[PDB]
Structure 1
Amino acid sequence: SQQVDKIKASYPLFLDQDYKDMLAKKRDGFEEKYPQDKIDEVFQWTTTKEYQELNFQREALTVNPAKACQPLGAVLCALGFEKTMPYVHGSQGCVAYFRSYFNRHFREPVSCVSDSMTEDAAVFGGQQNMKDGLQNCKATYKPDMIAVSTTCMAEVIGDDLNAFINNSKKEGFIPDEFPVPFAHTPSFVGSHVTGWDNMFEGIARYFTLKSMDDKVVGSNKKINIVPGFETYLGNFRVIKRMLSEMGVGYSLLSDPEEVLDTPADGQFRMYAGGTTQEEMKDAPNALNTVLLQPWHLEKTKKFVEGTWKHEVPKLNIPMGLDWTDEFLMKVSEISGQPIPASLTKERGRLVDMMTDSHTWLHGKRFALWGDPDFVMGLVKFLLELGCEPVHILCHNGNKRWKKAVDAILAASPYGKNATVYIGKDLWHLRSLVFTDKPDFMIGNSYGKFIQRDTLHKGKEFEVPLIRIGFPIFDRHHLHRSTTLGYEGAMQILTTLVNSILERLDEETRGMQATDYNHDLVR
């Protein structure tokens, strides 16, 4: 029943007594549900140390992964280029899923197309779909460039992308001159980050490989910046702003910021901004190329060092006080431009915020997960804040990276209880927060469920989730945040101190019980 004055949505509509009675009848009558005591006995079991061992013993089953496939990585990178349409060779269900995963996180339209390979296409090959697909897509969406990536069905059957694309041009489906960079992106190998790296090396390789003689390093006096797989707009914006502040000339390769952020002014824009084709062709002429997230930018590092002969500096993702300082000093050395007064003031403010918020932040225990560069950057920052990161998990990480992180943790007296896990899912993490309890969890929306599980054991055992990362689907416009630079550090610092204060308030809000500590000024 519904009062028209105050209509009830699922919640708290199902909380109504008629519905509660109905559900119970349904449960008792047809569900054949295990007793609640049994469910309780089993739930308390998963919270234990004994269960964590069996859980960590798994060699074949992955529960709740913290990683996604390659074409997602490829589609996002393809989005960085001007008037460019991402095109994925293979089955269509993948494209629907990439668009939706992106649409929800960015709450913006995502344009992507598929050649729609079928069961029949599996026996013959992907040649017809690629010719028709390239021809249809160009006629319909008018993209200046079409960047090909492939779905696992295509990778397993073995369609040759280069041969298919050339034959499409040769047969006359699309012009010879029309740009069609392509990258094979097997879902079984790697993650979306690797998928992003492949698409980029391919785009970079297509535009710059044939002509290198004319190119001379440092001739255009700009520094190439390769963002990597990035889902925060503030990050593209912050990197450009500082370089601009510094006066350094630069080329951001793969900039998806305008398109992921187009205005609702009555007209739909399929394409907005992006890295220009000429920017990509004139790239080898830069003084140097800086890679923002080096851990997933390995293939691109090899192409850039080997083909363009740029000496890519070894720099960590510019997160935290020290890494940002390093990035700026390095740009200063490559550009020859000094770090301005304006930027030095910003760093000053970050430190002032750090001195101001140090007592609440000190010693806090965090369990966090993400892509390897971001996690690595966050871990460095927390240690800079004197916080204690207990559980660090990167699903798509590796041994070299884990070695790099342990080194970072070893450098700080803070990283003592810290442990890095790779190849371990959120199910593993759930066990970790239950056995050894972090004050907080820093991660994407997938952790909403880990938090729910902990509160179930008890109020005192709950670990509140703090959302920094990708994908974030239960909060709005967080993708507009910045994690890079001083500004990013400031945003992260405010979210962590305030997450901590917000929690203290909840804990001390009880009347005549804990309100003695429910202070006005903190």
Structure 2
Amino acid sequence: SQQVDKIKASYPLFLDQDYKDMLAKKRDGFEEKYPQDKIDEVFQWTTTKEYQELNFQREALTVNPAKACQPLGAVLCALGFEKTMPYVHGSQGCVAYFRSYFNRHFREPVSCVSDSMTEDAAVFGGQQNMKDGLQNCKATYKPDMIAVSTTCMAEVIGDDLNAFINNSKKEGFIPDEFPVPFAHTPSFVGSHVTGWDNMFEGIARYFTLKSMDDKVVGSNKKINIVPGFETYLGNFRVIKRMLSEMGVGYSLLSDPEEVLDTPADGQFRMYAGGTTQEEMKDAPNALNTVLLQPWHLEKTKKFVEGTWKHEVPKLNIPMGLDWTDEFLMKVSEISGQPIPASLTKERGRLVDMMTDSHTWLHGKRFALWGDPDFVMGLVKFLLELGCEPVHILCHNGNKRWKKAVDAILAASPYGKNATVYIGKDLWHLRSLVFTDKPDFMIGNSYGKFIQRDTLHKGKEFEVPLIRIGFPIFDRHHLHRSTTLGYEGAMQILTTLVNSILERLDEETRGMQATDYNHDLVR
């Protein structure tokens, strides 16, 4: 039943007595459900060290991964180019998923096409799909460039992107001069960030490989900036703001900030902003190229160093105090521009915030996950805050990256209780937060199920989630945030200390029980 002036949605509608009795009867009569005491017993066992050991020896089963597949990254990279349509050669199912995944995180349209290869292409390849596909796409959506990547089906059957595109052009399906950069992006190799790297290097080689004799390093007086897989709009923005603030000429290669944030003014803009084709062509002429997320830009780095001849600086992602300082100093060194008073003051304001909040942050324990560069930047800043990054998980991380992170940790007393995990998933992390309970978890929306699981053991075992990363689907507009630079550090610091204070307020809200510590001032 419903009271017209107080309509109930699923929650709390199904809590009504008649629904509750109905669900009880459904269970008892037809679910042949395990007895509740048995369920409690197994649940408890899943929180033990014995279960954790069995959990960590898994070799074939993966549960609740913390990574996605290559083409997702290729699509995001492509989205950052002017009037460019991401095109994934292969099965269409993948494209419905890539779009939906980004639509929920950015709460914005996400354009991408597929050439719908089906069972009759599984045997002889998708050459015809590519011919008709490129023609239909250019004609229908009028992009000025089509960036091609692939689904696993096309990779497994061996479709040759280069040949397929050449033939499409040779036979007139699309103009010979129409830009169609491409990249093989197998989902069974690496992860979504690997797809970004592959797609980027593919677009870079398309516009510069054959014309390097025309380039002169440093002739355009700019600094190229390659962002990598980035899902926070404030990150593209803060980098451009700091560089402009320094009077540094630059070129952001793959800039999706405009297309991932169009205004709702009466018209739908399929395309907006983005790195121009001319900027890619001219890139070799820059003074140098800075990679913001080097751990997932290795192929791009080999091409930029080996072909463009840029002395790519060995810089970590600009997250936290030391690394933002290093990024600015290097940029200053390469461009010849001094670091201005405004940035020096911004730095000092972040330090002020750190001195003001250090007492609540000191010794707080965290479990965290995400992509490699983001995870190590988070780890570095946590150390700078006097916090303890106990469970560091990067499903798509690698051995060399782990060694680097272990070195960062060894350089700080606050890194003594930390352990870096690669190849492990969120089901592994779940055991860690039960056996060696931290104070909070810093991760994406999938972490909400772990919080729910810990609360079930008991309120005192609950590990609250602090949402930073990708994807974030259960909160609105956090994709507008910033995690890079002094601005990103201020935002993360504010989020961490207030998450601590919110939880403390929750624990001291008990009238005449725990409210003796429900302080007005903190």
TM norm. shorter chain > 0.5: yes
Q: 1:242: Cα distance to partner?
A: 0.1
Q: Deviations over 1:401-431 (max 9, x none)?
A: 0000000000000001100000000000000
Q: 1:222: Cα distance to partner?
A: 0.3
* Count of residues in correspondence between the two structures: 522
- Within 5 Å, which residues of 2 pair with 1:62-101? 62-101=62-101
Q: Deviations over 1:24-48 (max 9, x none)?
A: 0000000000000000000000000
SS in 1 for 2:393: strand
Q: 1:361: Cα distance to partner?
A: 0.3
Q: Deviations over 1:259-315 (max 9, x none)?
A: 000000000000000000000000000000000000000000000000000000000
Q: 1:124: Cα distance to partner?
A: 1.5
- Within 5 Å, which residues of 2 pair with 1:6-405? 6-405=6-405
CA distance in 1, matches of 2:149, 2:232: 23
CA distance in 1, matches of 2:4, 2:351: 54
Q: 1:59: Cα distance to partner?
A: 0.3
Normalising by structure 2, report the TM-score: 1.00
Task: Identify the residue that residue 502 of structure 1 maps to in structure 2.
Answer: 502
CA distance in 2, matches of 1:326, 1:437: 34
Q: Deviations over 1:199-248 (max 9, x none)?
A: 00000000011101110000000000000000000000000000000000
SS in 2 for 1:85: strand
Q: Deviations over 1:162-188 (max 9, x none)?
A: 000000000000000000000000000
SS in 2 for 1:501: helix
Q: 1:54: Cα distance to partner?
A: 0.2
Q: 1:16: Cα distance to partner?
A: 0.4
SS in 2 for 1:360: helix
SS in 2 for 1:460: helix
CA distance in 2, matches of 1:233, 1:355: 28
Question: Unpaired runs of 5+ in structure 2?
Answer: none
Q: 1:521: Cα distance to partner?
A: 0.1
Normalising by structure 1, report the TM-score: 1.00
Q: Deviations over 1:361-409 (max 9, x none)?
A: 0000000000000000000000000000100000000000000000000
CA distance in 2, matches of 1:390, 1:423: 17
CA distance in 1, matches of 2:294, 2:78: 19
Q: Deviations over 1:113-161 (max 9, x none)?
A: 0000000011121100000000000000000000000000000000000
RMSD of aligned alpha carbons: 0.3
SS in 1 for 2:390: strand
SS in 1 for 2:212: coil
CA distance in 2, matches of 1:167, 1:503: 61
Q: Deviations over 1:307-343 (max 9, x none)?
A: 0000000000000000000000000000000000000
Q: Deviations over 1:414-453 (max 9, x none)?
A: 0011000000000000000000001000000000000000
CA distance in 1, matches of 2:17, 2:101: 37
Identical pairs, percent: 100
CA distance in 1, matches of 2:259, 2:390: 38
CA distance in 1, matches of 2:149, 2:126: 13
CA distance in 2, matches of 1:126, 1:294: 34
CA distance in 2, matches of 1:235, 1:418: 27
SS in 1 for 2:149: strand
Q: Deviations over 1:461-518 (max 9, x none)?
A: 0000000000000000000000000000000000000000000000000000000000
CA distance in 1, matches of 2:126, 2:326: 47
CA distance in 2, matches of 1:54, 1:102: 35
CA distance in 2, matches of 1:268, 1:5: 36
SS in 2 for 1:5: coil
CA distance in 1, matches of 2:192, 2:41: 39
CA distance in 2, matches of 1:279, 1:112: 23
Runs of 4+ in 1 over 2 A off after TM superposition: none
CA distance in 1, matches of 2:101, 2:449: 18
CA distance in 2, matches of 1:42, 1:123: 47
CA distance in 2, matches of 1:250, 1:126: 40
CA distance in 1, matches of 2:457, 2:36: 14
CA distance in 2, matches of 1:323, 1:29: 61
CA distance in 2, matches of 1:241, 1:74: 26
Q: 1:68: Cα distance to partner?
A: 0.1
CA distance in 2, matches of 1:126, 1:199: 20
Question: Unpaired runs of 5+ in structure 1?
Answer: none
SS in 2 for 1:224: strand
CA distance in 2, matches of 1:370, 1:36: 35
CA distance in 1, matches of 2:12, 2:453: 21
